[PDB]
Amino acid sequence: SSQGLLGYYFSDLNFQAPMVVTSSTTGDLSIPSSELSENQYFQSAIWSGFIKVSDEYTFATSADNHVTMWVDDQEVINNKIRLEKGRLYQIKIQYQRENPTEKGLDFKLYWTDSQNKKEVISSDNLQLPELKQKSSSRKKRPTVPDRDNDGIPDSLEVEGYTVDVKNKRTFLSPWILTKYKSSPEKWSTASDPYSDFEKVTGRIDKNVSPEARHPLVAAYPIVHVDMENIILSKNEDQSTQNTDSQTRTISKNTSTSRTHTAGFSNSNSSTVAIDHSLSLAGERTWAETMGLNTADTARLNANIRYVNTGTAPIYNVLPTTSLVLGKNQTLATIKAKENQLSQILAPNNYYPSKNLAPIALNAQDFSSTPITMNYNQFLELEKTKQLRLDTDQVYGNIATYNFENGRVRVDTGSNWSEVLPQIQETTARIIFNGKDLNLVERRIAAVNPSDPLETTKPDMTLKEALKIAFGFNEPNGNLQYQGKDITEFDFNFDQQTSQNIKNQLAELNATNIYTVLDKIKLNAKMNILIRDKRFHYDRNNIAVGADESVVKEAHREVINSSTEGLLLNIDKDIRKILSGYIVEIEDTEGLKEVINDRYDMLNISSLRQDGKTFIDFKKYNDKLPLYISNPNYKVNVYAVTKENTIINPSENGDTSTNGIKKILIFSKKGYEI
Ligand SMILES: [Ca+2]
Numbered sequence: 001s002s003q004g005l006l007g008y009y010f011s012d013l014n015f016q017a018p019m020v021v022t023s024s025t026t027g028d029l030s031i032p033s034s035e036l037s038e039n040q041y042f043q044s045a046i047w048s049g050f051i052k053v054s055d056e057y058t059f060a061t062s063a064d065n066h067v068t069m070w071v072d073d074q075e076v077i078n079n080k081i082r083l084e085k086g087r088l089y090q091i092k093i094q095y096q097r098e099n100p101t102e103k104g105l106d107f108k109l110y111w112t113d114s115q116n117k118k119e120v121i122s123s124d125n126l127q128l129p130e131l132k133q134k135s136s137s138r139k140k141r142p143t144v145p146d147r148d149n150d151g152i153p154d155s156l157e158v159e160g161y162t163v164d165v166k167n168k169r170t171f172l173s174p175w176i177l178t179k180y181k182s183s184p185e186k187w188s189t190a191s192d193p194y195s196d197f198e199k200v201t202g203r204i205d206k207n208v209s210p211e212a213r214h215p216l217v218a219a220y221p222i223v224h225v226d227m228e229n230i231i232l233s234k235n236e237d238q239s240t241q242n243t244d245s246q247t248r249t250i251s252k253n254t255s256t257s258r259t260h261t262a263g264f265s266n267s268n269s270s271t272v273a274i275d276h277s278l279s280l281a282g283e284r285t286w287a288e289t290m291g292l293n294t295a296d297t298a299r300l301n302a303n304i305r306y307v308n309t310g311t312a313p314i315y316n317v318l319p320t321t322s323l324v325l326g327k328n329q330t331l332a333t334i335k336a337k338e339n340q341l342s343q344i345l346a347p348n349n350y351y352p353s354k355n356l357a358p359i360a361l362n363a364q365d366f367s368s369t370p371i372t373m374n375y376n377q378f379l380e381l382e383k384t385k386q387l388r389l390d391t392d393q394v395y396g397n398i399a400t401y402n403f404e405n406g407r408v409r410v411d412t413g414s415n416w417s418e419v420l421p422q423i424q425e426t427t428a429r430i431i432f433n434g435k436d437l438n439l440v441e442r443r444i445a446a447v448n449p450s451d452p453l454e455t456t457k458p459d460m461t462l463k464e465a466l467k468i469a470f471g472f473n474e475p476n477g478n479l480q481y482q483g484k485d486i487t488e489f490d491f492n493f494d495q496q497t498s499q500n501i502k503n504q505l506a507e508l509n510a511t512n513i514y515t516v517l518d519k520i521k522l523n524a525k526m527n528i529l530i531r532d533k534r535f536h537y538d539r540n541n542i543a544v545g546a547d548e549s550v551v552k553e554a555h556r557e558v559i560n561s562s563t564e565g566l567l568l569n570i571d572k573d574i575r576k577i578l579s580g581y582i583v584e585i586e587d588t589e590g591l592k593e594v595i596n597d598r599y600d601m602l603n604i605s606s607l608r609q610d611g612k613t614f615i616d617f618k619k620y621n622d623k624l625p626l627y628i629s630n631p632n633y634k635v636n637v638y639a640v641t642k643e644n645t646i647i648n649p650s651e652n653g654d655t656s657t658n659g660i661k662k663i664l665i666f667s668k669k670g671y672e673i
């Protein structure tokens with residue numbers, strides 16, 4: 001159904017002005033007018049492909065007077081020819097007719113066998129041309145200019161084309177739907193493993209991201225590891241003979257973010273934050289809790305998933321990951337067995353899938369290496385409550401389209417490691433956080449003025465890149481991402497990119513980038529980082545806070561209040577930058593009673609299934625509503641942002657909230673509750 005002969009239909013008599021490129025599954029090579037105005041008249045056509053059958057055959061068409069046909073460079077129409085089973089023969093057909101009186105083309109290709117049965121050639125017999133960068137049994141190729149052999153004529157790639165689905169196939173036509181342009185000299189304009197033609201005609205792995213079906217958007221995996229929770233325990237040692245002692249482990253939830261530190265690194269990394277909120281009774285040190293003496297060792301287990309935030313899937317190799325304490329203390333290497341993956345790792349997805357159990361670093365597996373820390377490393381983890389996961393870019397084999405059989409299959413001859421460098425060298429990179437404040441990278445084909453091949457690509461503007469790579473749209477004068485104007489996001493660039501864009505702005509006599517996005521041209525190797533302006537970002541470009549005015553405004557909508565808590569509607573992005581809340585009762589003279597007065601007791605908010613947030617005053621008040629002794633006392637509630645969050649007791653041991661920088665978000669007298 002994606003298989004057959006490939007046809008080019010031209011409005012002129014001499015194969016210069018292709019109006020339609022499309023394939024036919026059978027010898028019926030017609031395009032009726034209903035699938036198509038002054039240029040619906042076709043004066044020439046070329047069809048290309050292969051035939052596979054053992055007999056003497058006679059070829060004929062419905063217009064033999066206007067046709068030349070070759071079977072492997074032997075002219076068969078301008079004859080019984082012998083064809084053998086199990087063999088592939090090249091087919092080329094040319095058709096020319098001056099001043100046709102009907103629109104479209106009625107054209108059929110027949111053959112007659114030695115029992116004199118004549119019929120339109122069936123689908124089982126016809127195959128597409130080998131539109132690849134190398135020949136396979138099937139070579140590549142009255143020549144349509146097609147310098148890169150992807151199947152799209154030079155002129156269309158340069159001038160602009162559209163693809164439309166008509167019944168059961170794709171018509172590729174000149175632009176007068178999405179307007180495509182691509183390099184006529186790059187089989188894959190994004191330097192990825194899928195051709196410009198494969199992409200736009202759907203002859204491609206169904207798991208490739210929708211946006212990466214544009215020839216100007218790169219299709220490649222981007223993988224990091226998400227750690228969901230951790231369990232720490234004292235290692236057994238040769239000196240301790242008895243193993244029957246009580247459970248003394250520390251179990252914590254963890255939050256992991258993919259990071260970016262703009263920059264030039266194509267490295268994968270994620271940073272893990274270990275929850276500091278109360279989980280065990282007492283206020284013990286981690287050593288005290290687990291009974292670690294100064295000569296003991298501890299180990300760590302965790303649950304993880306791999307995340308693919310890129311645009312193409314992985315099939316047979318997961319990348320290797322280092323788990324790192326502090327700057328460079330590697331605690332573990334995490335690997336998966338090659339060629340034994342339980343599933344695909346698709347774009348915008350996880351491995352294992354979220355409907356399945358995550359992976360335990362030490363699986364309930366005789367050979368799993370313990371993830372051990374010495375005593376000083378353990379104390380460092382307790383202090384920092386951070387780990388890092390550095391993942392390589394080793395992604396294995398690629399599922400490619402095969403023109404012989406019209407199937408996509410993992411090709412042991414094709415490997416992501418042969419493609420990534422060229423993608424990185426020839427594209428502009430944009431990292432955007434508009435999807436839930438998580439950093440998502442895309443790469444867009446962009447000219448490199450210094451590399452002659454890369455100058456054969458279309459100009460990529462900043463506006464178009466944002467539209468095609470991230471789905472920005474323009475409904476009514478103004479570029480937007482899911483309702484949010486582009487002006488709600490900032491632009492940051494690496495040093496070279498910044499100078500380039502500065503010089504462009506100067507050349508345009510433009511002082512504001514947001515009003516000339518359609519005029520700013522991207523170049524290969526640019527790095528652009530675009531972040532939601534509402535937020536404060538750490539050195540990893542993780543959102544960790546927001547200005548007080550933003551935070552206050554975000555808590556203005558109170559549904560209900562009582563001595564039990566607050567019920568509010570709070571934007572999802574704002575919730576992401578808080579560690580918790582502090583509740584206080586303020587008496588008439590201005591003295592304050594802090595109710596949950598501990599750095600590990602701020603986790604009092606929860607998101608209900610109706611999407612509203614409840615801030616629970618009872619949780620750390622011994623399960624009791626607030627006692628307000630005089631109705632003129634105030635109940636004050638403060639938000640604590642991540643960047644302001646205390647994760648350890650103070651140097652002198654104080655576990656209270658004294659001196660924590662907090663933002664007042666609710667204040668009402670007792671009689672107002
Ligand atoms: Ca081409």
Ligand SMILES: [Ca+2]
Nearest residue numbers: 183186187196
């Ligand atoms: Ca091309």
